Ligand binder design. Sequence first.
Ligand SMILES: Nc1ncnc2c1ncn2[C@@H]1O[C@H](COP(=O)(O)OP(=O)(O)NP(=O)(O)O)[C@@H](O)[C@H]1O
Ligand SMILES: [Mg+2]
Ligand SMILES: [Mg+2]
Ligand SMILES: [Mg+2]
Length: 160
Amino acid sequence: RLSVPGNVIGKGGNAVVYEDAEDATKVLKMFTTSQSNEEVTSEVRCFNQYYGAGSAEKIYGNNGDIIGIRMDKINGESLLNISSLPAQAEHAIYDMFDRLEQKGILFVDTTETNVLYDRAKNEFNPIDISSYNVSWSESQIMQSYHGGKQDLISVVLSKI
Ligand SMILES: Nc1ncnc2c1ncn2[C@@H]1O[C@H](COP(=O)(O)OP(=O)(O)NP(=O)(O)O)[C@@H](O)[C@H]1O
Ligand SMILES: [Mg+2]
Ligand SMILES: [Mg+2]
Ligand SMILES: [Mg+2]
């Protein structure tokens, strides 16, 4: 088939992520479990909203089914593996939420495996981005968003 995999970077319960062997700035997130079209579309849309146009695009099979996402390789080390951070990292995690929120994103999955720390730049970058939205009452979303944001901040601050 068309997309060419490099090394496996990692995986989760939804996908295996390969380097794109044809573009060193990209990764191929290939779904191992069924995703709804809306799920994938929002994931891609959010990644582009935060990282800019052309940051993410869907990968299709020859039958027109969504089978994955080709997206920017995000720089940095997983917070899951970090056991020490500089005092400046506190300002870095704050800045990340500020940036998301300024793009209209209320980051849902605020787990330590979903952000990377770029130590040279002192930047945290989110990997998989989805947003709370009204379709969840407003008051419930705010509580749930608050909880996640403060949890992730706690993870960071405790390494300082
Ligand atoms: N755009 C990216 N750039 C660099 N690494 C990535 C990128 N996307 C995913 N990864 C890596 O691939 C691993 C797995 O990604 P992913 O499929 O999103 O599973 P997960 O979110 O960590 N676990 P799960 O909650 O079960 O889906 C991550 O831990 C990252 O290391
Ligand atoms: Mg078809
Ligand atoms: Mg740990
Ligand atoms: Mg993920």
